[model samples]
Target chain A: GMTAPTLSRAAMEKVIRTYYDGCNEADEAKMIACFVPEAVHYFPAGMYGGAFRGAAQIAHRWRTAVETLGSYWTIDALVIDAETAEAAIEWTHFKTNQDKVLRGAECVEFDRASGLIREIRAFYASPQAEGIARLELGDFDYAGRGYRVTSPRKPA
Target chain B: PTLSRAAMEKVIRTYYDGCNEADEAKMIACFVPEAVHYFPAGMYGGAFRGAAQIAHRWRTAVETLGSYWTIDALVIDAETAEAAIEWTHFKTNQDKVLRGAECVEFDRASGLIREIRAFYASPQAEGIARLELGDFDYAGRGYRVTSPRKPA
Candidate 1:
């Protein structure tokens, strides 16, 4: 069996930028090519019905945005941590038809085998939820992974 | 010189302490005078500009909403003088748990937080199609506003 090459930071950024280019072109094939077949694109709770599962769905969603929303996006900030093989970027999504712009950031993970995106978690700046207990990705295992669900420390 | 891990943590952790304890002074001390805290566009009137504003905003939140926060996970990029954290906020008044991430940039010379951009997701949020912080300059800062260079 061929061993997957170690994912490099340079390559990770390359894939992310390529993915964004695909988004700009509104080309589903190019977009989907940057993600693994099982990639999951996560949004804030209740947004886009929670998340887009699989490469096809993710690509289709963006293409539709371009068609209906007159969408174009720009990269605002980019960061990559080689130790974790993780990348993050802040972006602006413009709805030209409506003259509206949405800005947000995403944390992305890569598929080691192909260096394609395996998952993305998006965070946005928006109003608070009315009654949601936890405002986060649907079914994301924050607690299971030992992410703090509560702040118990005191200011020292 | 690369930033110190402990230095950043000390500043970040202490800032968290100030929030949970409603210690406005401590919170303000963690930042420089020019520091800015950004929230979602619809939030806090498009973010709290300057250290005083951020300190006061959180202090008010703690007092009125019985608010508290915890740092769930943290990563420090020494070379870049930047960091990020996953956090949970407890709005005890409304009995809600808010989780999100914040990317932090520091003043390299002073080892203090200079800019904090907060991110969180909400259900409904009145379904605003375009959401971002008001008064923040994405263009001037050289954040990618267009796609990467195209390949042949």
Candidate 2:
């Protein structure tokens, strides 16, 4: 009991909820609190002018959406991984003005020091049959994370 | 397998390996008999039900379409027997690459993948009504079925 309590497992759940709460309300200040100053919110490549680079921009983008697009999002399901301080949640983005709902999931990473969201890499449930070069979170370091980069097939 | 961090990751790692290698039998070894893999509607005709069916479909994808995949990022929760991973699909035949993420549910005791609900970032076909993972019970699973009420 002598060692300091590093962080609570609920950190992941709390931050995500707080973020959505702020987002739902269009309260940029509250939303800003959930992310670090340099936190990034990544989206599918070729969408939303690329990922929102910083906390302010992220909040401002959502605020604009709420005003112009009648946009609001809800957290349908959430799964937490305390081991890595990361969580994934299913969400529904309702563009009421357009009467459209885009369903997707976000892989959220938390900063260990600040317990704030460092990045939210979002992926939509869009059709995959289309011919596209690559549909990933633009600028994410896939190779740096030791993700698979090559095919298992032996080249002929 | 025990509900430990390593145990959870091993299952996902094994499954992805099976997929990348196009090894059907190896893939089914990581799922229960009745596993289901769900994708966005309008893809593959519909969801692939059962572990065997899932394996066969992917195996065919490899042979026919030159589909290969790599794990971009993964996070697991042993307590909930769930995990999420971002993936990159290399469709060499079509010279295309697709990135997506799957939220996986594993049976606690068996430690095998029970279900996979995949979400992609591919372009949505025009006039697509609802863009959710096909056959997934969003409401039943307590997912927010509607948009949030006016922000506070």
Candidate 3:
């Protein structure tokens, strides 16, 4: 086992930025490389609120979310605490297949010894039950069971 | 004027401890009387200004949803006077839980919280409804929905 020193603000910020950079580039390998083997991600609202744990599982969740949602993320702000190895990132999730967007934030905790991200808690608003799929204007029929039009297409 | 790293952590921890204890007075004392509390998603379905209102907001939330905030992690950058706290808000009303976090900025000169912007994602469900602090009333929203506060 390796003993890890506390990370610096700059060092941690680099990790956060690099993670987004990987997402922006859609580089699955680069993104997964940022986490430890026991990483977990918590999504409070989306595709059934829950968490994805472990490196392999986290990476798979990322892959599935991207492939299914076609949403790309861009970091707006990243604040880190070096002593505690924690960070919060404000980001915008852009729908590549639609003109819509989702603004959200993530709180990330890093494992002290390895400096690898151990957990991530994400927060974002979406309609109830239907997931975050973008619906076209006039597609929603209030008080109705479903949309008026074909409803926005989702990743198949 | 600047707080040491230890001092920074102390303030942050004290704030949350007061919350867990439901010690409104203690929580209010942690910040300047004129401190501003913001909710990126709106607190209590709305944002509140000043220590009294902020304290009241928390009080209302605790009473309404039987919510208690537990800090899972706290990170601080003493140089920048910024801190990020990862927390889970538990609701006894529905036996439900919501996980989220907040970023707080401290006044370097005073070491008091200048602003607290909490973040969370949830449906407009009843239990979590009380968690809405305020809108993205920051710059992009032209500070429209943010509750009136001492100028930041």
Candidate 4:
């Protein structure tokens, strides 16, 4: 009988934080190392410019984004699910050069074998001023307003 | 304990299939009485709260707008009670198609969904009409393209 692979929530969390730290510090090498050779990062054009694939190309995209747009990410909230090797994060993007800020969320799929991120899909749109205003600093509201307060079902 | 991953995935897939069959009762059953469906304001103005509201929104999208939803990708995490699903929403009325994703959170005690937040890039024009191309030109870095100049 084949046994199921173990899920490491801690490892996923660590890699996510490390990747964001690289973006904040403009460290290309650190960010690139977080992903496998074939990893892909999808950015919302309405927010982080656009999408790119592969470690090298993604690293290049981030490098250019940081250099040209002065882009950096602040992880507000991160939820990791080891059972499914999946994670989601809500972050605020601050464009220092453009003097623009946007709030968006991204969901990531991790490779079970290597524990590296296999896919990243981010969602955001323009005129984020209104959306940004709705978000409180450091508040993790990715689960919708109602869910944040109460879960419909009580423990039985 | 949280709901198992398999159960959560089954609930989500079942809801989509219900919509495809126009089984309104089946689709409505997927959510709890207090479930909330939040979509971009541009799509439906705002969030639809409660079962009635949520089901009404889905019904409008299906019966009125002539929309069909197909799940393209799905990822579920039972440990965190969360799921991320990618779907293609086909609108037969406007001749537009939208490829979007939804982030769903499930209740730990109950298998029903708690909330669903949707995201998409753009609404594409479908069918032969989509073949039409725009006339524009670009210069500096070719970032922004200007509309075609009027004939003299």
Among all candidates shown, the one with the greatest lDDT: 2
Task: For candidate 3, give the lDDT of residue A19.
Answer: 77
Question: Model 1: how far is A43 from its true place, Å?
Answer: 0.9
| Candidate 1: count of backbone clashes, pairs at least 3 residues apart or interchain | 7
Candidate with more favorable, higher DockQ: 2 or 3:
2
DockQ of 4: 0.06
Q: Please give, for residues A61-92, the per-residue lDDT of candidate 4 as tens digits.
A: 77777777777666644667776687877555
Highest DockQ among the candidates is held by which one? 2
Which scores greater on TM-score, model 1 or model 3? Answer: 1
lDDT of 3 by residue, B1-152 (tens): 76887887788888877766667897887788778776644335555678777777777767776767766556677777877776666665645555556778787777777787766645333333222235544456332222121122
Error in Å for residue A117 of model 4: 2.0
TM-score of each prediction: 0.82, 0.90, 0.70, 0.70
For every candidate, how close is chain A to the native chain A in TM-score?
0.87, 0.89, 0.70, 0.73
Please, what are the lDDT tens digits per residue for candidate 1 over residues B50-71?
A: 8989989888999887888878
Model 3 steric clash pairs? B42-B132, B42-B133, B42-B134, B43-B132, B43-B133, B43-B134, B44-B132, B45-B132, B46-B133
A best-first ranking of the candidates according to their TM-score comes to: 2, 1, 3, 4
Candidate 2 lDDT, B28-134, residue by residue in tens: 99999899999987777889999999999988888887888877778787767788888878777866677899889889878789999898866555797688888
Put down candidate 4 lDDT per residue, B1-152, tens digits, no spaces.
66887898889988887776667777777878788776543345556777677766677777875767766556776667887775656665654545456678787777888777665543221221111111211133242122121112
Off by over 4 Å in 1: A1-6, A112-114, A149-156, B4-10, B73-75, B123-130, B138-152
lDDT of 2 by residue, A68-104 (tens): 7788888876888776678899788887666777888
Question: Model 4 off-target regions past 4 Å?
Answer: A1-7, A43-50, A76-84, A96-99, A125-156, B123-152
Instruction: Report fnat for all candidates as fractions from 0 to 1.
Output: 0.58, 0.64, 0.23, 0.08
**i-RMSD per candidate, Å:** 4.9, 2.8, 13.7, 15.5
